[PDB]
Amino acid sequence: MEPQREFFHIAGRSAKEYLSENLVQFIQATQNYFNIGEKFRDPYVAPSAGV
Amino acid sequence: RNAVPNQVTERKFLVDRYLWQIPFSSNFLNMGTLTDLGQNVMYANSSHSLNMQFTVDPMTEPTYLMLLFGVFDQVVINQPTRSGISVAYLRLPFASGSAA
Amino acid sequence: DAPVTPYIWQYQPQTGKAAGARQNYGAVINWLSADNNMFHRVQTVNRARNLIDEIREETVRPDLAASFNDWTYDQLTQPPGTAYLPAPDPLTGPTTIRDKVLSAEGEQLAGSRPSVLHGAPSSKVLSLLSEAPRIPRTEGMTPYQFANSFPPVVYEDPFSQNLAVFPKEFSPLFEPENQVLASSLA
């Protein structure tokens, strides 16, 4: 359940974390002309505790 | 001036292009793509049946029912070497269970 | 070199029993077009979810599995409530005797003071509202208890033991009327 959803980013860490640190600094520099950062899925989860 | 009395009012509506949706949420809001009842442990770690039924208007011809279930189509795709490419698909909850 | 998929349980909402156990299809990674490098990554997170489930199935409290689908009252979570305090004498009520005395003096009375709810002298009276029933509940588990106990079991080798430890409870057509008796068997 938990490790299955983190390998495919059903849930888990956002795109700023599970990528390499050098790969994040690349796709921020070349974002204005050669967009890469839309090729990596970003999770977005509900709280489900106290809402 | 001389309108007919005893007249009765009829209502209807028309939605085009819409595809009626029921969100699988506790309060029917969008608090996330992964909903709040989706990460409930009561559903994910216990198999449940499903018995739903609709009562549409009758029509003079056969008709389908284009029902959709919200799943998470996901891929990963590595390219580890030269001329090498491979994927690992899943979709949950409705995975094509053939691998065991 | 592939681990097995864990058997997930089926909860029957009426009677609270478990209606067998099928394997967890619908949560299976489609590895059928992966090379030798992605296959090792996929079968690692399959060995990770089995390692989580083997930790969770260590605490299955092994006398619920002995009386499987045959649970009695002391093995079930009961709704909370106090013990039995006897009901007080209605002659000792605050306005019962004085209504028989003040009226017989000649008065006609109408009117009364609101109660404690606004609609052991006094702890005996207010214990009526939070009282447990006489006989507790038998033969049924709430889904709070069916999820706390009975995790998704893992069945590492499929059906390669003696027939006495054959997992007969995984069939949905399992009644507790048969020869061999249940125990902690994964």
Neighbours of B52 (CB within 10 A): 6
- Both tokens assigned to C60: 């299955």
Question: Considering only CA atoms, which of B24, B44, B41, B22 is closest in space to residue B32?
Answer: B24
Q: How far is CA C14 from the centre of its chain?
A: 13
Neighbours of A27 (CB within 10 A): 17
* DSSP-assigned states of every residue in C111-176: -----TT----STTTGGGTTB--SSPP-S---HHHHHHS---B--SSTT-S-GGG--GGGSSS--S
* Residue found under tokens 């992605």: C38
Distance, CA of C17 to CA of C171 (rounded, Å): 13
Resolution in units of Å: 3.4
* Residue A44 exposure: Cα atoms within 13 Å on the Cβ side: 7
Distance, CA of B37 to CA of B95 (rounded, Å): 19
Handedness of CA C96, C98, C100, C106 (dihedral sign): negative
Residues of C in contact with A2 (CB under 8 A): 49, 52
Is the Cβ pair A3, C49 closer than 8 Å? yes
Burial (CB count <10 Å: 0-12, 13-18, 19+), residue B34: middle
**CB pairs A-C closer than 8 Å:** 18
Instruction: Please give the DSSP secondary-structure letter assigned to residue C178.
Output: S
Distance, CA of C180 to CA of C168 (rounded, Å): 9
Question: Considering only CA atoms, which of B43, B45, B51 is closest in space to residue B24?
Answer: B43
For residue B89, what are the β-bridge partners?
B75, C30
Of B34, B37, B92, the CB nearest to A45: B34
Distance, CA of A34 to CA of A51 (rounded, Å): 40
Distance, CA of C108 to CA of C103 (rounded, Å): 6
Indicate the helix (H) or strand (E) that contains C21.
strand C18-23
- Both tokens assigned to B68: 């959709």
- Both tokens assigned to A28: 């921020």
Using CA atoms in the order B94, A7, B44, B99, what is the torsion angle rounded to 10 degrees? Answer: 50
Instruction: Please give the DSSP secondary-structure letter assigned to residue B2.
Output: -
Is the Cβ pair B98, C8 closer than 8 Å? no
Give how far C49 is from chain A: nearest CA, Å. Answer: 6
* Residue A24 exposure: Cα atoms within 13 Å on the Cβ side: 8
* DSSP-assigned states of every residue in C54-86: HHHGGG--TTTTTTTT---GGGSPPPP-B--PP
Distance, CA of C87 to CA of C16 (rounded, Å): 34
- Both tokens assigned to C41: 């990554």
* DSSP-assigned states of every residue in C102-128: HTTTT---------TT----STTTGGG
Residue in chain C closest to B74 (alpha carbons) equals C29
Distance, CA of B50 to CA of C97 (rounded, Å): 62
| CA angle (A5 as vertex; A25, C12 as ends), nearest 5 | 165
* Residue found under tokens 């007969």: C168
Distance, CA of C64 to CA of C178 (rounded, Å): 18
Round the CA-based radius of gyration of chain A to a whole number and report it. Answer: 14
Distance, CA of C135 to CA of C150 (rounded, Å): 26
Instruction: Please give the DSSP secondary-structure letter assigned to residue C9.
Output: E
Is the Cβ pair A3, C29 closer than 8 Å? no
Is the Cβ pair A3, C45 closer than 8 Å? yes
Is the Cβ pair B40, A48 closer than 8 Å? yes
* DSSP-assigned states of every residue in B45-97: TSB--------PPP-SS----------EEEEEEE--STT--EEEEEEESS---
Instruction: Please answer whether residues B99 and C28 qualify as being in contact, where contact means their C-beta atoms are separated by less than 8 angstroms.
Output: yes
Distance, CA of C168 to CA of C171 (rounded, Å): 6
- Both tokens assigned to B46: 């216990």
Residue B14, φ and ψ in degrees, nearest 5: -140, 120
- Both tokens assigned to A38: 């839309």
Instruction: Please answer whether residues C9 and C21 qualify as being in contact, where contact means their C-beta atoms are separated by less than 8 angstroms.
Output: yes
Distance, CA of B59 to CA of C43 (rounded, Å): 51
Distance, CA of C68 to CA of C176 (rounded, Å): 8
Distance, CA of C52 to CA of C153 (rounded, Å): 11
Q: Which residues contact C72 (CB under 8 A, 6 or more apart)?
A: C138, C139
In order of B44, B94, C175, the CA distances from B70 in angstroms are: 15, 9, 36
Distance, CA of C186 to CA of C53 (rounded, Å): 12
- Both tokens assigned to C47: 């060995």
SS3 at position B34: strand
